[PDB]
Design a protein around this ligand. Structure first.
Ligand SMILES: *[C@@H]1O[C@H](CO)[C@@H](O)[C@H](O[C@@H]2O[C@H](CO)[C@@H](O)[C@H](O[C@@H]3O[C@H](CO[C@@H]4O[C@H](CO)[C@@H](O)[C@H](O[C@@H]5O[C@H](CO)[C@@H](O)[C@H](O)[C@@H]5O)[C@@H]4O)[C@@H](O)[C@H](O[C@H]4O[C@H](CO)[C@@H](O)[C@H](O)[C@@H]4O[C@H]4O[C@H](CO)[C@@H](O)[C@H](O)[C@@H]4O[C@H]4O[C@H](CO)[C@@H](O)[C@H](O[C@@H]5O[C@H](CO)[C@H](O)[C@H](O[C@@H]6O[C@H](CO)[C@H](O)[C@H](O)[C@H]6O)[C@H]5O)[C@@H]4O)[C@@H]3O)[C@H]2NC(C)=O)[C@H]1NC(C)=O
Ligand SMILES: *[C@@H]1O[C@H](CO)[C@@H](O[C@@H]2O[C@H](CO)[C@@H](O[C@@H]3O[C@H](CO[C@@H]4O[C@H](CO)[C@@H](O)[C@H](O)[C@@H]4O)[C@@H](O)[C@H](O[C@H]4O[C@H](CO)[C@@H](O)[C@H](O)[C@@H]4O[C@H]4O[C@H](CO)[C@@H](O)[C@H](O)[C@@H]4O[C@@H]4O[C@H](CO)[C@@H](O)[C@H](O[C@@H]5O[C@H](CO)[C@H](O)[C@H](O[C@@H]6O[C@H](CO)[C@H](O)[C@H](O)[C@H]6O)[C@H]5O)[C@@H]4O)[C@@H]3O)[C@H](O)[C@H]2NC(C)=O)[C@H](O)[C@H]1NC(C)=O
Ligand SMILES: *[C@@H]1O[C@H](CO)[C@@H](O[C@@H]2O[C@H](CO)[C@@H](O[C@@H]3O[C@H](CO[C@@H]4O[C@H](CO[C@@H]5O[C@H](CO)[C@@H](O)[C@H](O)[C@@H]5O)[C@@H](O)[C@H](O[C@@H]5O[C@H](CO)[C@@H](O)[C@H](O)[C@@H]5O[C@H]5O[C@H](CO)[C@@H](O)[C@H](O)[C@@H]5O)[C@@H]4O)[C@@H](O)[C@H](O[C@H]4O[C@H](CO)[C@@H](O)[C@H](O)[C@@H]4O[C@@H]4O[C@H](CO)[C@@H](O)[C@H](O)[C@@H]4O)[C@@H]3O)[C@H](O)[C@H]2NC(C)=O)[C@H](O)[C@H]1NC(C)=O
Ligand SMILES: *[C@H]1O[C@H](CO)[C@@H](O[C@@H]2O[C@H](CO)[C@@H](O)[C@H](O[C@H]3O[C@H](CO[C@H]4O[C@H](CO[C@@H]5O[C@H](CO)[C@@H](O)[C@H](O)[C@@H]5O)[C@@H](O)[C@H](O[C@H]5O[C@H](CO)[C@@H](O)[C@H](O)[C@@H]5O)[C@@H]4O)[C@@H](O)[C@H](O[C@H]4O[C@H](CO)[C@@H](O)[C@H](O)[C@@H]4O[C@@H]4O[C@H](CO)[C@@H](O)[C@H](O)[C@@H]4O)[C@@H]3O)[C@H]2NC(C)=O)[C@H](O)[C@H]1NC(C)=O
Ligand SMILES: *C1O[C@H](CO)[C@@H](O[C@@H]2O[C@H](CO)[C@@H](O[C@H]3O[C@H](CO[C@@H]4O[C@H](CO[C@@H]5O[C@H](CO)[C@@H](O)[C@H](O)[C@@H]5O)[C@@H](O)[C@H](O)[C@@H]4O)[C@@H](O)[C@H](O[C@H]4O[C@H](CO)[C@@H](O)[C@H](O)[C@@H]4O[C@@H]4O[C@H](CO)[C@@H](O)[C@H](O)[C@@H]4O)[C@@H]3O)[C@H](O)[C@H]2NC(C)=O)[C@H](O)[C@H]1NC(C)=O
Ligand SMILES: *[C@@H]1O[C@H](CO)[C@@H](O[C@@H]2O[C@H](CO)[C@@H](O)[C@H](O[C@H]3O[C@H](CO[C@H]4O[C@H](CO)[C@@H](O)[C@H](O)[C@@H]4O)[C@@H](O)[C@H](O[C@H]4O[C@H](CO)[C@@H](O)[C@H](O)[C@@H]4O)[C@@H]3O)[C@H]2NC(C)=O)[C@H](O)[C@H]1NC(C)=O
Ligand SMILES: *[C@@H]1O[C@H](CO)[C@@H](O)[C@H](O[C@@H]2O[C@H](CO)[C@@H](O[C@H]3O[C@H](CO)[C@@H](O)[C@H](O)[C@@H]3O)[C@H](O)[C@H]2NC(C)=O)[C@H]1NC(C)=O
Length: 440
């Protein structure tokens, strides 16, 4: 019996230049709860290929995610494909509340191929994500024009001369970042800068290129430029800054004109393995930026440094009340539309230790009063507002983490923090005054 998943996200993808052969899909979209360290996630992907007119499925099983422990994941088994296919795919957690999936091309994951059908296509991708609260989140990303996986294990070419500028390039979330120093003879004012990279490690060949053109008038100190690495561009664009490190016209000897160069290119897959080599090409020309003069090269390493900001953002609200059961009104689902046919309030007692018990409080337009939800109350109010009644009365400010989500999947997470019990004034049983011991 196949998935139901409330909340499905569409996503168009296309290939820019020929690929380095990763093939990468990122998903700013799933829920990673803030102030939650026990929050597992049940990921299950599914690629829909095409061989001849024939459409062939491939279900991968990533099992359970442990965001507070593991950053990178590999499917643990996969029904419907070749073998040694288990490490053909790669699901990596990234920055703020998001995922990326990298399944390499040039190594067919479909054995179902007779020599005849050497030609294989990748039509779309399904990434299932079952919530800690048990909400299945689907994310169907579809290749604009089918992408052709064409086996190869060819060219194991390194580049040649290139002065090694020992400085290591490190990748964090598929985003590389290095600052290489470089000097350009003949560049005071009349300098045309043109950089071009190419991370050539492993069976992977990424190739980045300035797109908006060259920096024709290289002003002094921090020129920012955009670059387009071949593959599947990331929402966080990829750029670089050429900053100057030498006087205007005030040098004359050997040291031509010094510059500090910083590269920030994106989709740079771990598949590239560590000990790959970043080639940086540059000239001081405008006639043929192509294959021009100087080449500088650096080694790259893939940190397994679990991204920091993994949990989704928060807007805390402080309440203080006395009635021994407070009430917050989770405002409108997303914004301006009191006619969604799918709202979902969702409660949380901050930093919960146990999954089988702490994630039971949930509401919907058609539900009401959830099974295991102890001491939290929730029911919709006027204009789609949602009042939550917290009655777990203590004398130590509990912070509740609410999450609401529209039919659009525009999640929004509050973080109310009930100061609760302010406490009775000492003279509670008396305090009836009149000026008698004071002038009047
Ligand atoms: C990297 O990429 C980089 C960027 O993409 C690139 O820069 C780099 O590559 C190369 O770098 C080279 C330098 O390193 C550079 O040369 C390359 O770029 C260009 O070169 C071409 C070709 O150049 C020339 O060859 C011509 C023929 O041989 C020659 O006419 C030119 O000029 C002379 O000056 C010498 C010095 O006196 C003289 O000995 C010569 O005999 C000759 O007269 C030059 O040798 C250029 O064509 C091209 O561009 C134009 O732009 C440049 C820069 O602006 C000019 O030098 C050139 O003349 C031409 O431009 C003008 O064009 C527009 C359109 O009309 C004008 O509106 C604009 O303002 C500009 O001109 C002025 O010139 C007019 C014509 O003479 C004047 O009439 C005008 O008027 C005046 O008003 C003023 C106030 O408003 C004053 O009043 C002034 O004054 C005098 O005033 C006194 C009293 O005060 C009195 O009244 C008197 O009567 C009066 O006369 C008025 O005249 C105004 O002055 C390029 O710029 C470059 N490559 C490229 C493609 O960029 C790349 N690197 C690599 C390695 O890849
Ligand atoms: C590194 O990467 C970075 C990211 O890529 C990059 O940064 C980007 O740089 C960009 C610059 O290219 C920036 O985009 C711009 O930013 C300026 C800031 O405002 C923004 O608005 C953007 C779009 O809405 C938005 O994306 C941004 O976030 C931002 O908020 C903006 O001012 C810029 O300029 C204008 O100029 C561009 C370029 O030409 C033009 O496309 C825009 O329309 C706009 O210019 C108009 O207005 C002026 C004055 O009125 C006119 O002089 C212009 O001619 C033009 O206007 C019109 O004439 C038409 C004819 O009469 C008329 O139709 C138009 O009106 C309405 O226009 C509608 C569409 O625009 C539509 O056409 C509508 O429709 C009817 O249409 C039908 C048919 O459809 C019929 O024609 C009908 O007749 C008609 O009525 C019209 O009525 C106008 O009046 C520019 O947008 C961006 O900020 C930035 N991004 C980021 C995140 O940084 C870096 O640069 C890269 N780094 C390097 C170093 O390169
Ligand atoms: C990998 O990296 C390496 C290094 O990081 C890159 O190396 C280099 O490639 C470039 C080309 O890309 C070569 O280019 C030109 O080089 C010259 C000269 O180089 C020096 O030669 C001096 C003089 O003698 C001669 O030797 C050369 C070559 O054999 C012949 O061409 C001549 O005919 C002549 O025989 C020599 O004096 C100078 O230095 C000495 O220093 C050493 C060590 O200190 C001593 O052993 C020696 O005794 C000398 O002592 C000196 O030391 C004292 C003490 O400080 C000092 O007082 C003295 O004054 C003296 O320095 C070198 O050995 C360079 O002149 C050219 O310069 C032009 O560029 C300038 C910089 O921007 C600019 O300011 C100038 O105006 C010139 O510019 C213009 O050229 C353009 C383009 O052609 C024109 O369009 C424009 O209009 C102008 O004409 C120029 O740089 C380098 O020589 C080469 N370096 C090495 C070490 O090999 C390599 O490229 C890179 N590879 C890749 C793929 O990126
Ligand atoms: C909160 O509210 C929202 C809104 O109400 C709810 O969202 C709705 O959610 C429900 C389910 O919960 C969705 O059903 C519903 O609609 C869309 O999805 C269904 C399913 O679509 C796709 O899946 C089909 C099932 O397939 C799988 O099948 C394979 C093999 O068969 C299995 O092995 C897999 O394991 C897997 O499970 C596919 O068959 C289907 O299509 C095939 O077609 C492809 C392209 O045409 C082809 O290339 C591919 O190879 C496949 O073979 C697809 O992948 C759809 O049925 C609905 O779509 C219609 O459009 C289809 C495509 O255009 C037509 O084929 C179909 O006849 C439908 O009819 C059309 O209507 C249009 C416009 O009115 C008209 O022009 C046209 O003439 C047709 O009559 C649909 O897109 C969404 N509804 C909305 C509004 O988005 C949400 O569930 C709820 N949440 C909560 C909390 O409960
Ligand atoms: C499922 O996957 C399996 C395996 O992944 C697929 O099947 C296999 O078929 C491969 C060939 O197509 C076999 O080749 C491996 O071993 C090679 C030999 O090993 C190094 O080779 C040196 C030189 O070679 C010969 O020596 C042999 C023994 O002496 C001899 O038979 C032969 O005649 C030659 O004389 C040898 O001296 C040295 O001691 C060592 O044996 C090796 O060259 C193969 O390539 C590698 O390349 C990949 C890609 O990087 C790496 O992942 C591998 O670990 C391995 O090693 C490196 O190469 C890197 C890049 O150059 C380098 O940077 C790095 O440092 C390292 O040295 C290959 O390993 C397999 O043995 C065979 N496997 C099995 C189990 O039978 C199978 O088809 C797949 N199935 C499907 C459906 O897809
Ligand atoms: C703050 O919020 C809390 C919850 O969010 C509000 O809830 C009250 O809190 C207490 C717990 O702290 C609940 O126990 C309370 O409960 C029900 O209490 C009744 C029990 O009745 C009595 O009689 C027996 C037998 O003689 C006796 O042994 C016992 O001690 C007691 O005296 C239930 O009967 C009642 O349910 C019934 O009544 C309705 C209407 O007729 C029926 O439709 C129901 O089916 C059911 O039979 C209560 O549910 C709970 N109180 C209420 C009224 O909700 C708390 O009120 C709130 N504080 C304020 C002031 O807002
Ligand atoms: C999220 O869910 C909302 C509530 O259902 C959608 O309205 C919203 O919208 C796409 O958003 C568009 C912006 O209003 C809207 O667009 C179109 O058609 C009109 C009429 O020709 C044009 O004026 C607009 O330019 C626009 O193309 C669509 O209704 C909407 N699509 C759907 C199916 O809702 C969703 N937003 C997101 C994140 O997708």
């Amino acid at each position: 019996a196949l998935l139901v998943c409330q909340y499905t996200i569409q996503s168009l993808i296309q290939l820019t230049r020929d690929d380095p052969g990763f093939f990468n899909v990122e998903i700013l979209e799933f829920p990673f709860y803030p102030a939650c360290n026990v929050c597992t996630a049940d990921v299950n992907a599914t690629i829909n290929f095409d061989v001849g007119g024939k459409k062939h499925k491939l279900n991968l099983d990533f099992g359970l995610l442990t965001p507070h422990t593991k950053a990178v994941y590999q499917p643990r088994g996969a029904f419907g494909g070749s073998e040694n296919a288990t490490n053909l795919f790669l699901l990596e957690l990234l920055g703020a509340g998001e995922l990326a999936l990298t399944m390499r091309s040039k190594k067919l994951p479909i054995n179902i191929t007779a020599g005849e059908e050497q030609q294989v296509s990748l039509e779309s991708v399904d990434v299932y994500f079952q919530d800690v609260f048990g909400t299945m989140w689907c994310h169907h990303a579809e290749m604009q024009n089918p992408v052709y996986l064409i086996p190869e294990t060819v060219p194991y070419i390194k580049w040649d001369n290139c002065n090694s500028t020992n400085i290591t390039a490190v990748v964090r979330a598929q985003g590389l970042d290095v600052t290489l120093p470089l000097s350009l003879p003949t560049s005071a004012q009349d300098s045309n800068f043109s950089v071009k990279t190419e991370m050539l490690g492993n069976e992977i060949d990424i190739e980045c290129i300035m797109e908006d053109g060259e920096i024709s008038q290289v002003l002094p100190g921090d020129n920012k430029f955009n670059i387009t690495c071949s593959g599947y561009e990331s929402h966080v664009p990829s750029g670089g800054i050429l900053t100057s490190t030498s006087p205007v016209a005030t040098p004359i000897p050997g040291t031509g004109y010094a510059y500090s160069l910083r590269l920030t290119p994106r989709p740079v897959s771990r598949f590239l393995g560590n000990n790959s080599i970043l080639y940086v090409f540059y000239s001081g020309n405008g006639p043929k930026a192509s294959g021009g003069d100087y080449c500088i090269q650096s080694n790259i390493v893939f940190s397994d440094e679990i991204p920091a900001s993994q949990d989704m953002p928060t807007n805390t609200t402080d309440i203080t009340y006395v009635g021994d059961n407070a009430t917050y009104s989770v405002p409108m689902v997303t914004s301006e539309d009191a006619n969604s046919p799918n709202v979902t309030v969702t409660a949380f007692w901050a930093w919960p230790n146990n999954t089988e018990t702490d994630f039971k409080c949930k509401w919907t337009l058609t539900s009401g009063t959830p099974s295991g939800c102890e001491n939290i109350s929730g029911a919709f109010a006027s204009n789609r507002t949602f009042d939550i009644t917290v009655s777990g009365l203590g004398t130590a400010p509990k912070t509740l983490i609410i999450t609401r989500t529209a039919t659009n999947a525009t999640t929004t997470t509050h973080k109310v923090i009930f100061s609760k019990a302010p406490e009775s004034t000492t003279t509670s049983p008396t305090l009836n005054t009149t000026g008698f011991a004071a002038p009047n």
